[PDB]
Design a protein around this ligand. Structure first.
Ligand SMILES: CC(=O)N[C@H]1[C@H]([C@H](O)[C@H](O)CO)O[C@@](O)(C(=O)O)C[C@@H]1O
Ligand SMILES: CC(=O)N[C@H]1[C@H]([C@H](O)[C@H](O)CO)O[C@@](O)(C(=O)O)C[C@@H]1O
Ligand SMILES: CC(=O)N[C@H]1[C@H]([C@H](O)[C@H](O)CO)O[C@@](O)(C(=O)O)C[C@@H]1O
Lengths: 138, 138, 138
């Protein structure tokens, strides 16, 4: 069909907006807050989905950051790689290939974000990529 | 339609299970053995598809590991990046961004896994990502 | 439906061929010039989509290479990661995980290619991955 709007909301009430398409056993879902743009004819700007410490579960093990969500859809997605920028508490930052999934636990959707080791605690993760998940239902 | 079960089998008789959907010129296929889970409310476990030396062709050139398969479907897929853990014979291991495709040769499906150089011979590759391929047929 | 042929053309008249499928709000598009092959039973060859300096806009900021295109389709795609080889003017080269999108500016399609810093100016970028974009329209 045509693309339907939706959103998830984080623990700190951040709204993550998306559009989706739901066919037979298929759900395709794109996050739409950070679609990058050419702002003039020579410059491309990435936009970030910004996720702070307070959006993650504690304790964090093995560079796995879990973002409990409310609302939206309940899918076991595949893993997608993304561009991350991981900001440490001392404001240093590392660009990384991150790996993201949507999973369901206790009937709730969670975003799983895995990245590499950093020399410090993380203040914030920015997803700089446009994320789209193709998912199989049932 | 609804999602149909299938599998490939490796040279050592490892079974790689998947579900798929086949529409007009479109085949979407997800490997389902290693769907990660939140096992309690704070911990996410990745699962691995584990591929050993004996599942690969010899000789291996340019960090390209070829896994001949039997059964399943015959597709020329796009390339997907994945999380790999590459275990060396001396049990050291390296986490890498791997790149995976399905290709067909002599009427047989093969999984192509490319990764980075490692200081040793590889005993095992673990794919820690949930893999889904969207493929164009004909 | 069945897969339709198309192409984009670069500033230097390089033709980038693709096949696509356009359903309701959905456009799936695969670039087809560099489908890798097993050429004998033990060897896999990657093929490259080769993009030179003259195919990019100037000035280049933040390791973002913008390839203005003509013809083809007009989509705001998600970001896909790919295998790049980035060739410097002194012929040294770096293998990287690149991130690619299609975007539209002034009614024209552009391919956005982002990679990592390199110690020199880039002569050429080779995309060694088979690229397929799943896109949401409207
Ligand atoms: C990836 C996956 O399978 N997730 C499932 C989890 C885990 O399987 C449990 O940890 C097993 O106890 O179980 C559910 O019943 C749940 O609690 O919501 C459904 C959910 O989809
Ligand atoms: C990616 C690709 O094109 N693979 C094709 C190969 C190679 O083209 C051959 O190496 C050309 O001789 O050829 C086939 O006939 C084959 O042997 O099964 C079909 C297969 O899909
Ligand atoms: C990602 C995105 O939104 N791109 C859009 C751009 C930018 O929004 C402009 O920079 C805003 O002025 O605007 C268009 O009208 C354009 O010039 O073709 C449509 C295009 O799809």
């Amino acid at each position: 069909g045509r693309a339907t709007n939706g959103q998830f909301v984080t623990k700190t009430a951040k709204v993550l907006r998306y559009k989706f398409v739901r066919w037979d056993a298929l759900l395709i879902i794109q996050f739409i807050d950070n679609i990058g743009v050419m702002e003039n004819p020579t410059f491309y700007r990435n936009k970030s989905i910004e996720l702070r410490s307070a959006d993650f579960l504690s304790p964090m093990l093995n560079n796995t950051y879990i973002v409990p969500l409310n609302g939206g859809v309940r899918v076991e997605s595949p893993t997608i790689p993304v561009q991350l920028e991981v900001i440490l508490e001392n404001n240093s930052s590392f660009i990384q290939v991150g790996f993201v999934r949507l999973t369901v636990k206790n009937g709730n959707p969670h975003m799983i974000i895995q990245c590499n080791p950093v020399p410090g605690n993380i203040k914030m993760i920015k997803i700089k990529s446009v994320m789209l998940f193709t998912c199989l239902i049932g």
